[PDB]
Ligand binder design. Structure first.
Ligand SMILES: *C(=O)[C@H](CCCNC(=N)N)[C@H](NC(=O)N1CCN(C(=O)NC(C)(C)C)CC1)C(=O)O
Ligand SMILES: [Ca+2]
Length: 223
């Protein structure tokens, strides 16, 4: 997260870190045994880490649970990043409390202008590299689809939305992928892609979760 702030330990209870020997992507806990992340974050041998603040120090509220299965969206295209969403099932159900909680799926799609909270353990610099050990947060508005399309000609599908600032300076970045974009307590997006990070006129592009509620619900009901 570039140009954000330190969240505060366990203040984003649904934020999870996907670990395969190291943190490689974020995710959002949607119920005691399912996590939603980005399809581009797919890899075998995932251990889901919940209750995390400093990902490099065991501080006492963590729950490390291996994934039993991952389900990449059936129409995911890795070249265009269309349908960049994936479900991960935990081997055992997480113990839910104030610090570890699920985030609700949306009942409606959020509109341009809606303020959201984006979080993650990704790079904090737009040029160069610096990884924070504690969770970073960023309050950012969803941008209009026209400004989104104008920013990325021929690349924005109906399953994507831009969020951020055209001025640059504030955005998600490498290491934040798969993480949450929450608006009014509902998971509206997944950190997907962008050109570099926090660059002028290159806002973050997010998977439009509201388009996938039926798929998520049906997939969970049968797996
Ligand atoms: C996500 O972290 C990156 C995009 C963030 C959004 N950018 C922005 N708003 N301007 C994404 N990098 C990324 O997710 N990858 C793939 C998964 N990781 C990994 O360890 N790779 C394996 C092959 C799975 C081992 C981290 C790097 C990006 O740069 O597009
Ligand atoms: Ca920790």
């Amino acid at each position: 997260i570039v140009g954000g702030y330190t969240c505060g330990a366990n203040t984003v209870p649904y934020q999870v870190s996907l670990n395969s020997g190291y943190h490689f992507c974020g995710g959002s806990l949607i119920n005691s045994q399912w996590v939603v992340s980005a399809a581009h974050c797919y890899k075998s041998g995932i251990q889901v880490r919940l209750g995390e603040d400093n990902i490099n120090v065991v501080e006492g509220n963590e729950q490390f649970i291996s994934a039993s299965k991952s389900i990449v969206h059936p129409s995911y295209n890795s070249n265009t990043l269309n349908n960049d969403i994936m479900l991960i099932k935990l081997k055992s159900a997480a113990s839910l409390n104030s610090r570890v909680a699920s985030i609700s799926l949306p009942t409606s799609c959020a509109s341009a202008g809606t303020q959201c909270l984006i979080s993650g353990w990704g790079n904090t610099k737009s040029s160069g590299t610096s990884y924070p050990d504690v969770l970073k947060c960023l309050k950012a508005p969803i941008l209009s689809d026209s400004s989104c399309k104008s920013a990325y000609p021929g690349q924005i599908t109906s399953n994507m939305f831009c969020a951020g600032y055209l001025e640059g300076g504030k955005d998600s970045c490498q290491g934040d992928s798969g993480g949450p974009v929450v608006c009014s307590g509902k998971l509206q997006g997944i950190v997907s892609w962008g050109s570099g990070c926090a660059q002028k006129n290159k806002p973050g592009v997010y998977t439009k979760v509201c388009n996938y509620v039926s798929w998520i619900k049906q997939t969970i009901a049968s797996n």
